[PDB]
Amino acid sequence: SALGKLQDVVNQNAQALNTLVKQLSSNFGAISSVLNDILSRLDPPEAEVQIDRLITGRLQSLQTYVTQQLIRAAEIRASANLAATKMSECVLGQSKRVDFCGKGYHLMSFPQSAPHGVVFLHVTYVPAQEKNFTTAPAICHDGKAHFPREGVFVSNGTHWFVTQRNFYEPQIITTDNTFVSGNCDVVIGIVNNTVYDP
Amino acid sequence: QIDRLITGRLQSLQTYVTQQLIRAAEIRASANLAATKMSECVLGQSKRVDFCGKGYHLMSFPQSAPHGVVFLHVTYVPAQEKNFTTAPAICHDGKAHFPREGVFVSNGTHWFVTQRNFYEPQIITTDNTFVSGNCDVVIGIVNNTVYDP
Amino acid sequence: YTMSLGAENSVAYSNNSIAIPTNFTISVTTEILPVSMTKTSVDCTMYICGDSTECSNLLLQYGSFCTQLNRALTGIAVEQDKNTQEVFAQVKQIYKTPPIKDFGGFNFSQILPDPSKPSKRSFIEDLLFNKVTLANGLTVLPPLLTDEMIAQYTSALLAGTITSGWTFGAGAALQIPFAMQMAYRFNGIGVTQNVLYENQKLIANQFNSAIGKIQDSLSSTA
Amino acid sequence: TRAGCLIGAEHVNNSYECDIPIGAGICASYQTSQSIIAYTMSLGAENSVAYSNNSIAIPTNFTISVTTEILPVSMTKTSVDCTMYICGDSTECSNLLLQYGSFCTQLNRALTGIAVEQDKNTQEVFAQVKQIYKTPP
Amino acid sequence: NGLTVLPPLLTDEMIAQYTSALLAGTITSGWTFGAGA
Amino acid sequence: TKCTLKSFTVEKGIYQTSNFRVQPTESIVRFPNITNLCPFGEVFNATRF
Amino acid sequence: LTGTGVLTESNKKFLPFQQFGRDIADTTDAVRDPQTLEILDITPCSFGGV
Numbered sequence A: 001s002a003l004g005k006l007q008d009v010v011n012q013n014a015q016a017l018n019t020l021v022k023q024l025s026s027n028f029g030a031i032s033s034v035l036n037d038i039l040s041r042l043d044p045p046e047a048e049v050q051i052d053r054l055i056t057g058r059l060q061s062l063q064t065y066v067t068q069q070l071i072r073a074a075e076i077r078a079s080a081n082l083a084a085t086k087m088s089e090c091v092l093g094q095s096k097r098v099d100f101c102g103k104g105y106h107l108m109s110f111p112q113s114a115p116h117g118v119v120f121l122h123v124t125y126v127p128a129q130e131k132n133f134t135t136a137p138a139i140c141h142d143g144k145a146h147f148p149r150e151g152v153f154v155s156n157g158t159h160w161f162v163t164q165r166n167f168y169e170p171q172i173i174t175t176d177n178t179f180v181s182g183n184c185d186v187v188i189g190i191v192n193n194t195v196y197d198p
Numbered sequence B: 001q002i003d004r005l006i007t008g009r010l011q012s013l014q015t016y017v018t019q020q021l022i023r024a025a026e027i028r029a030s031a032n033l034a035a036t037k038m039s040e041c042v043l044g045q046s047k048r049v050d051f052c053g054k055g056y057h058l059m060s061f062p063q064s065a066p067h068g069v070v071f072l073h074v075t076y077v078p079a080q081e082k083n084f085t086t087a088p089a090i091c092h093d094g095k096a097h098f099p100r101e102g103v104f105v106s107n108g109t110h111w112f113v114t115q116r117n118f119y120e121p122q123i124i125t126t127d128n129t130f131v132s133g134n135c136d137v138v139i140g141i142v143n144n145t146v147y148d149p
Numbered sequence C: 001y002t003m004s005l006g007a008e009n010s011v012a013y014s015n016n017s018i019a020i021p022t023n024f025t026i027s028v029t030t031e032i033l034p035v036s037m038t039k040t041s042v043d044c045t046m047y048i049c050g051d052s053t054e055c056s057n058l059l060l061q062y063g064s065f066c067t068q069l070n071r072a073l074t075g076i077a078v079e080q081d082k083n084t085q086e087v088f089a090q091v092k093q094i095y096k097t098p099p100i101k102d103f104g105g106f107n108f109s110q111i112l113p114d115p116s117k118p119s120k121r122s123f124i125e126d127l128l129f130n131k132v133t134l135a136n137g138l139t140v141l142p143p144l145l146t147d148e149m150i151a152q153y154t155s156a157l158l159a160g161t162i163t164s165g166w167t168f169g170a171g172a173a174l175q176i177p178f179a180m181q182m183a184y185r186f187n188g189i190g191v192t193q194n195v196l197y198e199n200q201k202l203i204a205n206q207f208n209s210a211i212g213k214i215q216d217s218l219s220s221t222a
Numbered sequence D: 001t002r003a004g005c006l007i008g009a010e011h012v013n014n015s016y017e018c019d020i021p022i023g024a025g026i027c028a029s030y031q032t033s034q035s036i037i038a039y040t041m042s043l044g045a046e047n048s049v050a051y052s053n054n055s056i057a058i059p060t061n062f063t064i065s066v067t068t069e070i071l072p073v074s075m076t077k078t079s080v081d082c083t084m085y086i087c088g089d090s091t092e093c094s095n096l097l098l099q100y101g102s103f104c105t106q107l108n109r110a111l112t113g114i115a116v117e118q119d120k121n122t123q124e125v126f127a128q129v130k131q132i133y134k135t136p137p
Numbered sequence E: 001n002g003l004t005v006l007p008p009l010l011t012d013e014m015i016a017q018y019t020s021a022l023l024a025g026t027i028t029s030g031w032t033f034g035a036g037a
Numbered sequence F: 001t002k003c004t005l006k007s008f009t010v011e012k013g014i015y016q017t018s019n020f021r022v023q024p025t026e027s028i029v030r031f032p033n034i035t036n037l038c039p040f041g042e043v044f045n046a047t048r049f
Numbered sequence G: 001l002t003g004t005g006v007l008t009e010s011n012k013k014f015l016p017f018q019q020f021g022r023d024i025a026d027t028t029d030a031v032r033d034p035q036t037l038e039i040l041d042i043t044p045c046s047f048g049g050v
């Protein structure tokens, strides 16, 4: 399955450690790669040169290792703050941000533990089965333009309806769900039909 | 001499790769900021003030650039403000009346309800007026005629 | 000079006194975020070996430092590819450019790539690409994302934005009239939909004037 | 490619999803006779939408689907003992350590800060609320 | 050679318990577990 | 901790201390148990050299 | 071979032409006692986890 992103952390940590021990395997230009040999056949006025060479080489190797692991941990901090953001409004609320917390309209996210990671269950609203329809910006009734209080003014053939944009639930045009503002001449594209009263 | 020159070159190389590596980390921080601006400015609307444009953000048009992104941050910027007179609620028939939307706003003597960011006055009517409680618990109420349709 | 903290604006908290904007302006501004950086890589043999006769003896003792540094640089290069990948391919649904006709009075010839030329480069994109002046074992790796595919991704994002609204994120590309999408994005700042539709010509003229100003300002060579 | 000449894989006029790169908008993968293949970039599935005057679309159904998003939040803690690294099992351990051990002391302080940051990563992602709740029936 | 791996403070059992508490707050209390009771 | 941080006051927390604890006081020598004399008399007294 | 560290008993078998051993270089873990021909290991004086 798609668990390679979690495996890469352990794989690269193992690569850092075994590359480090292979660095420590080197001799760094000294006469031997071990400290005990050069401390067994060299007087200190000649031994301290090789000691300095080996210690500087091992400390440079440790410097490269701590640099790699350290800014890698900074990148893991960036991803951790991203995940804690996904803890912040996907688990403890609802996110209006598109595509950040799941493909589609986000509902929830169920946290699940993982080895050195967090695995998300981003359940999402995904619409399908689209249909063509005809819309207008407003309806003029009694010389007054009528705007959608909610949803989209959606007509199929003759009956004019208002309905929300994310689901096809048709309701008849009625003044309770219809908002009126001004006359119907300034706006282009207005149609006209009977707006009912309850 | 080979050891000295190779260690000098490798020290120069490790300084170079540290500078490039955390410079790329800062570039990644800016890249995540831009991808955040790619996530609710062009894929939606951001209610965050000043984050995605000086004003109230409407849209954003992504335009390509050499090793970067330049945004087209279209924004709402209001101006031309006038002084008016306001009061938290309205009292009628011994009951406090709260704004369903907008601010209770008066000029002269007539009292109107209107949204905060545009001077579009509506007459006070029970359809856009919300009623809650009596007239005495709140401080600072004006009283007038609330109309019924 | 001393710092300019700002212009002094005298305003009053006086209660029982409110202010409402009678008239509004629409102004577009540029925010510039460098999202990618040039890829770099080093060859170990041409760096520390060079033209040395004992290239083998130099390699096994000291080339492992360069091996670590090249691994770090390769990781940086992969990170730089992923930067532009996640900023430009959040949605991987590629679109044709819609026919440029009747965009509610908003005149989108400058920002959309014209079909007259077979590159997906926009006019403002052409100005941006023209105005930016570019510039021993060090090799500059080219980026994975070429300029043509980045331009195509921006074209697809623009085409989804001005036609489908924001539904292209949820995978159905439901087409919207641009006046309706503009009204629905005015609905998010607390102002009612009547303001746009009552003054659509003024909004279109303001946006066209802003586009002209941002074209003239971004063509002064400084 | 614009990066350079690629020998060893065959190009194809079709387009497939990229997993590993080449460097010039080309990618390679394992695909079928089976061998290594090289393909151009997958810009994606092509969707034909028609912007039209006074027309709207509305979904009849909707689908609910859960997707896996995986974010590595923590990384394995490591620490280096200075004496056992630079001194090892060798004589004159005191003389080796007072001159060069503080480099390792700085690096170990950096590694301890990294370890504290790694604990704080899982602490702030998993204990934003510190009120434990028993499992409901 | 001196490379020691420090175990994390937050063990797997308590991470599982925190995850269970978050799920219990999410599916029974809703999102009020963040603020209040 | 005061020695490994080179200060007389340290704060609260955790500190990995360096190994300054034990100093050995004994020495052992082990060699192969062959005690013949090497022919340095043949080499350094070479009459025909 | 001079050094400071504790020694214990190991069970791995050497080749006839091999007398020393270093599982990882710069550690010098393996050695044979000349007197008893007992295969042993060489470890540092104390574990570093304090």
Ligand SMILES: *[C@@H]1O[C@H](CO)[C@@H](O)[C@H](O)[C@H]1NC(C)=O
Residues within 6 Å of the ligand: A131, A132, D048, D050, D052, D055
């Ligand atoms: C009707 O819907 C189909 C869906 O495939 C689309 O291709 C077509 O352009 C639509 N017609 C109009 C007039 O929008």
Ligand SMILES: *[C@@H]1O[C@H](CO)[C@@H](O)[C@H](O)[C@H]1NC(C)=O
Residues within 6 Å of the ligand: A156, A157, A158, A159
């Ligand atoms: C509109 O659609 C409904 C349901 O899809 C259908 O029953 C009806 O005949 C259509 N036309 C009119 C004029 O309502």
Ligand SMILES: *[C@@H]1O[C@H](CO)[C@@H](O)[C@H](O)[C@H]1NC(C)=O
Residues within 6 Å of the ligand: A188, A189, C102, C104, D053, D054
């Ligand atoms: C849509 O386009 C047609 C062009 O044939 C035009 O006549 C009509 O007025 C447009 N409707 C609008 C802009 O609402």
Ligand SMILES: *[C@@H]1O[C@H](CO)[C@@H](O)[C@H](O)[C@H]1NC(C)=O
Residues within 6 Å of the ligand: A191, A192
């Ligand atoms: C509807 O509008 C058209 C054009 O504006 C007009 O000719 C027609 O008389 C109107 N119908 C009604 C019932 O108002």
Ligand SMILES: *[C@@H]1O[C@H](CO)[C@@H](O)[C@H](O)[C@H]1NC(C)=O
Residues within 6 Å of the ligand: B082, B083, C010, C012, C014, C017
């Ligand atoms: C009226 O508006 C002006 C705007 O410049 C402001 O300076 C003044 O304080 C306002 N008066 C009151 C009483 O709020």
Ligand SMILES: *[C@@H]1O[C@H](CO)[C@@H](O)[C@H](O)[C@H]1NC(C)=O
Residues within 6 Å of the ligand: B107, B108, B109, B110
């Ligand atoms: C309020 O302002 C309007 C115009 O803004 C003006 O006609 C009117 O006389 C003013 N006073 C009242 C009481 O409406």
Ligand SMILES: *[C@@H]1O[C@H](CO)[C@@H](O)[C@H](O)[C@H]1NC(C)=O
Residues within 6 Å of the ligand: B143
């Ligand atoms: C309005 O309130 C004032 C003071 O509370 C009161 O004197 C006045 O009679 C009230 N007017 C009406 C019409 O209720």
Ligand SMILES: *[C@@H]1O[C@H](CO)[C@@H](O)[C@H](O)[C@H]1NC(C)=O
Residues within 6 Å of the ligand: B139, B140, C014, C015, C016
């Ligand atoms: C603010 O309200 C109080 C009553 O709560 C009133 O006494 C005071 O005069 C008001 N301030 C102004 C600026 O009129």
Ligand SMILES: *[C@@H]1O[C@H](CO)[C@@H](O)[C@H](O)[C@H]1NC(C)=O
Residues within 6 Å of the ligand: C023, C024, C202
């Ligand atoms: C509002 O501002 C626009 C932009 O300049 C202007 O054209 C229009 O005349 C103004 N309207 C009023 C009532 O001042």
Ligand SMILES: *[C@@H]1O[C@H](CO)[C@@H](O)[C@H](O)[C@H]1NC(C)=O
Residues within 6 Å of the ligand: C107, C108, C109, C110, C212
């Ligand atoms: C507006 O678009 C038209 C194409 O419909 C184009 O001819 C014109 O040049 C554009 N305006 C500007 C200022 O570029």
Ligand SMILES: *[C@@H]1O[C@H](CO)[C@@H](O)[C@H](O)[C@H]1NC(C)=O
Residues within 6 Å of the ligand: D013
């Ligand atoms: C693949 O594209 C090349 C480019 O011209 C063409 O010559 C060749 O016939 C194509 N192969 C197939 C199987 O269509």
Ligand SMILES: *[C@@H]1O[C@H](CO)[C@@H](O)[C@H](O)[C@H]1NC(C)=O
Residues within 6 Å of the ligand: D060, D061
């Ligand atoms: C919507 O999809 C569901 C699930 O497949 C199906 O049962 C239902 O019949 C569909 N609705 C319509 C109107 O086709």
Ligand SMILES: *[C@@H]1O[C@H](CO)[C@@H](O)[C@H](O)[C@H]1NC(C)=O
Residues within 6 Å of the ligand: F033, G035, G036
């Ligand atoms: C090696 O010599 C020592 C010295 O007397 C003796 O004690 C030991 O037994 C000898 N070992 C063998 C294997 O001969």
Ligand SMILES: *[C@@H]1O[C@H](CO)[C@@H](O)[C@H](O)[C@H]1NC(C)=O
Residues within 6 Å of the ligand: F040, F041, F044, F045
């Ligand atoms: C070599 O010969 C001289 C004279 O006979 C003698 O003094 C010396 O000890 C000899 N060297 C050795 C190593 O026995």
